[PDB]
Amino acid sequence: MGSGAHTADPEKRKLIQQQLVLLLHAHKCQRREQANGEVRQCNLPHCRTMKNVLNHMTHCQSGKSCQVAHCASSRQIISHWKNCTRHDCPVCLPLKNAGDK
């Protein structure tokens, strides 16, 4: 497998916001199929990975203790975005605005 990056890099925070989008889309993208029983072709194939994560998160019983691929990240990430509120948080706030760009 290979190890040597459990803390990741600082640029990850930046990727967190971007990733959140892939995890954000993948979220409603993964619920649009299971909530209708059928699935439809998606524009960006990048959501695929997340679909395997969001699905794994269902099999993920450790969540914050799991380290499967992005599991801990998808759980840790969505976590921040879930508990995060107010303050100098340019993640959920702006993404919640969508006023311009």
Partner: protein, 52 residues
């Protein structure tokens, strides 16, 4: 009576449109990624994502 403390990844994106972020995905290049970087508690100014 039916209390509740947490559901399952509620997130604040249940109001967002999958079309909006879509345009943002192409604009940044989220739909053309070849290598998905790792996301682990790196920086110190974002340690708030612990939730421990």
């Amino acid at each position: 009576g039916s209390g509740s403390g947490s559901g399952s990844n509620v997130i604040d994106t249940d109001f967002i449109d999958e079309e909006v972020l879509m345009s943002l995905v192409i604009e940044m290049g989220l739909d053309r990624i070849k290598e998905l970087p790792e996301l682990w508690l790196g920086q110190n100014e974002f340690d708030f994502m612990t939730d421990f």
